[PDB]
């Protein structure tokens, strides 16, 4: 793709090819914890990932995605602000060149080292491609990563990154259990937003968890060794693949907790 995260094709340029970049419900945003409204009508999230089937990990030149079999209700998200059942299709991360940046959402202007996005689509629309054209088509669970202790359940991912260093490489990636990426608490903020990469469609109910997970410096270091470029092209390290916070405009962030 022509878009990317550099000086000449990065997020401040995206609106020329994707005019929705300046839309009314763009993501990410800063979550102002004192202005977020506690909504006691929000239900607990229901995450059912015991039957998840991972298939493949791939470097798509802007992040790396772990892809799941979503041809049946095997790993689903329900409850919270959602209606209906949303199936997990892929997860990926955004991270920085240094530990003090990398998350897309911020919490009272605080940046975290990275942000994990678990992407799910509304099974009433039949496939992911139809779901992205609907205002309630996707639900993305966002989880912040801070640097501290290692996360053992992430190690299987960091160990295969060597095999998908450059854009377009993929590897088999089976029997990965995404339950090892979840914090203890499922308390969350939710708001209506968009994909944070092109095509930036406004089809996302965001569900951002309050509690970060900790990963080790050595674990996030290995993310920073991947490349944006394809094999044989000049080396450009895959770092700072985050979009800056966008205006909230006419939107309220709701919290599941006080
Ligand atoms: Na993608
Ligand atoms: Zn993302």
Curated annotation (Swiss-Prot):
Annotated keywords: Acetylation, Cell membrane, Cytoplasm, Disease variant, Lyase, Membrane, Metal-binding, Osteopetrosis, Phosphoprotein, Zinc
Q: What is the effect of changing residue 16 to E?
A: In Jogjakarta
Describe the pH dependence.
Optimum pH is 6-8.
Residues flagged as site, Involved in the binding of some activators, including histamine and L-histidine: 90
* Residues bearing the modification Phosphoserine: 163, 170
Q: What is its main location?
A: cytoplasm
> Impact of mutating residue 60 to D?
Strongly reduced activity
Q: Where is this site: Fine-tunes the proton-transfer properties of H-64?
A: 5, 60, 65
Q: What is one process in the GO biological process aspect for this record?
A: regulation of intracellular pH
Outcome of swapping residue 62 to W: Impaired activity, rescued by 4-methylimidazole (4-MI). Impaired activity, not rescued by 4-methylimidazole (4-MI)
The effect annotated for residue 142 to R is: In OPTB3; complete loss of activity
Record text on cofactor binding: Zinc. Can also use cobalt(II) with lower efficiency, but not copper(II), nickel(II) and manganese(II).
Q: What is the effect of changing residue 62 to A?
A: Reduced CO(2) hydrase activity, rescued by 4-methylimidazole (4-MI). Reduced proton transfer. Enhanced proton transfer. Enhanced proton transfer capacity
- The record places domain Alpha-carbonic anhydrase at 1-257
- Outcome following mutation: residue 65 to L: Reduced activity
Q: What does the annotation give as the result of altering residue 63 to S?
A: 2-fold decrease in enzyme efficiency, as determined by kcat/KM ratio, and efficiently inhibited by chlorzolamide
The cross-references to InterPro entries, in alphabetical order and at most eight, read: CA_dom, CA_dom_sf, Carbonic_anhydrase_a-class, Carbonic_anhydrase_a-class_CS
Q: How is its activity regulated?
A: Activated by X-ray, histamine, L-adrenaline, L- and D-phenylalanine, L- and D-histidine, L-His-OMe and beta-Ala-His (carnosine).
Q: What is the effect of changing residue 60 to T?
A: Reduced activity
Subcellular localization(s) per the UniProt record: Cytoplasm; Cell membrane
Alphabetically, the GO molecular function entries are: arylesterase activity; carbonate dehydratase activity; cyanamide hydratase activity; zinc ion binding
The miscellaneous annotation reads: Target of drugs used in treatments against glaucoma disorder and breast cancer.
Briefly, what is this protein's role?
A: Catalyzes the reversible hydration of carbon dioxide. Can also hydrate cyanamide to urea. Stimulates the chloride-bicarbonate exchange activity of SLC26A6. Essential for bone resorption and osteoclast differentiation. Involved in the regulation of fluid secretion into the anterior chamber of the eye. Contributes to intracellular pH regulation in the duodenal upper villous epithelium during proton-coupled peptide absorption.
Its subunit composition reads: Interacts with SLC4A4. Interaction with SLC4A7 regulates SLC4A7 transporter activity. Interacts with SLC26A6 isoform 4 (via C-terminus cytoplasmic domain).
This one is known as Carbonic anhydrase 2
Q: Which organism is it from?
A: Homo sapiens
Taxonomic lineage: Eukaryota, Metazoa, Chordata, Craniata, Vertebrata
